Amino acid sequence: ITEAALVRDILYVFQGIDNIKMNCYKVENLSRSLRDTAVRLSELGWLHNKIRRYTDQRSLDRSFGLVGQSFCAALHQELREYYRLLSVLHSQLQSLTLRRLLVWTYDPKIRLKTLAALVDHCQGRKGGELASAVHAYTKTGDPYMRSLVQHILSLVSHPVLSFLYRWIYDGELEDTYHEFFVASDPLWHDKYTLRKSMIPSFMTMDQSRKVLLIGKSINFLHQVCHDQTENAFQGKIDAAYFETSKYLLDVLNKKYSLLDHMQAMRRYLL
């Protein structure tokens, strides 16, 4: 068996398509110096399977949510590039050898090491609980991984910050699948519950009680009151707080005006 023939099959084992057959890609003759280097190279292709099965099994059921899509659709932009590398490597096979591949594919032996171990740490997590389990991969320090995962977080946490900027300025939460940590009940004491399970890790437990209070302050301002209208992130919550609440008292003291009712509920009821 010529060395060139091995270089022909390996360029397929990098994808899943099997001399080299299918958990290690046991190769089945040739000299021992060849089988050993194939084994490690063939195994990199096996990883590519574990990351492909997830982005194919969960791209099937429609009950994975809105965050579980931006994650399952951000594991593909990090795979087209892995399909560009296989393009270049195939054009030169017409020269490269085994010992020349090791340096070519030494870096995509790591990105296919974090992604193939990022989809196992978050298996049953849907909704925000998944955007909180791909953030527990940033406390790593490794400047090559902390700058990769801190990009997938910037895509996975886009739908979460889509409900938040909706449940703060308009107070109209809408999620058929239960993802947002503000659960409604089909106007102050009930119909609003802080979901302890779907709070993202990158929001402190106190910040999660200022959104449930800004959403409630606007939802209640419309129906019952009968009226219609990072560090910069923390400043946005407080900006939406020191304006909405200050307006809720004005409409509750001039038209009835939460404060204007406390005084009026003492004059008569007391």
């Binding site: 195939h90 886009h158 739908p159």
Partner: protein, 231 residues
């Protein structure tokens, strides 16, 4: 006879026939079977090719099921929305007839190996997988008029974070709702309701609570908030 043919060269024969399969024209080896279209490749071919060919063909089947939605849903028995949804879904098929033209020319020079094909079609495998899901969710429940515009406002919200399949479903809705919105312009600044096919939300009759009645089915589900101020 690809069995008695060398390995590294027969791959250049499949990539030629494979390009024809994307077009939908019956090829030499990769043929089609009578009708969700299922293909057959060959009994005696290399294992490390067929398992790779069968990964591309899901862009042929998702095209032999969209071209059959254009050549059908353009009839007059369907309204002024199942028309525009079938025209704005025809500009795309043209842009796919070019991405197979650029490959038919780049293959002459020998620069198109099978492994190189599996990379270039990656975007054309994802777009033809959205149009082959609306063309099967518009025929599942018979939609014409408004209910075929509620679907294109929910299939566009489910992709709220993809940004590669939401810039698309926002091009279909923005184009499959102009004819519906050109009669609304006539039922707002004036009283005349043309609506030849029975699809508009408001239908007239022949002392006035029975003349014009809101139809419940044909409400676009994004005008649901103002379904009363319209009438």
């Amino acid at each position: 006879l690809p069995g008695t043919l060398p390995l590294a060269s027969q791959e250049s024969a499949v990539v030629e026939d494979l390009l024809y399969v994307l077009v939908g024209v019956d090829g030499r080896y990769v043929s089609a079977q009578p009708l969700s279209r299922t293909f057959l490749v060959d009994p005696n071919l290399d294992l490390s090719i067929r398992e790779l060919v069968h990964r591309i063909l899901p862009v042929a089947a998702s095209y032999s099921a969209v071209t059959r939605f254009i050549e059908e849903k353009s009839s007059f028995e369907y309204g002024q929305v199942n028309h525009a949804l079938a025209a704005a879904m025809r500009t795309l098929v043209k842009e796919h007839l070019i991405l197979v033209s650029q490959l038919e020319q780049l293959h002459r020079q020998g620069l198109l190996s099978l492994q190189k094909l599996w990379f270039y079609i990656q975007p054309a495998m994802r777009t033809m997988d959205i149009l082959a899901s609306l063309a099967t969710s518009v025929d599942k429940g018979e939609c014409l008029g408004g209910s075929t515009l509620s679907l294109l406002h929910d299939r566009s919200f489910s992709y709220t974070g993809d940004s590669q399949a939401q810039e698309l479903c926002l091009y279909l809705t923005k184009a499959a709702s102009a004819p519906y919105f050109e009669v609304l312009e006539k039922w707002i600044y004036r009283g005349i309701i043309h609506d030849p096919y029975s699809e508009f939300m408001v239908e007239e009759h022949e002392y006035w609570d029975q003349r014009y009645t809101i139809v419940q089915q044909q409400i676009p589900s994004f005008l649901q908030k103002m379904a009363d101020k319209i009438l």
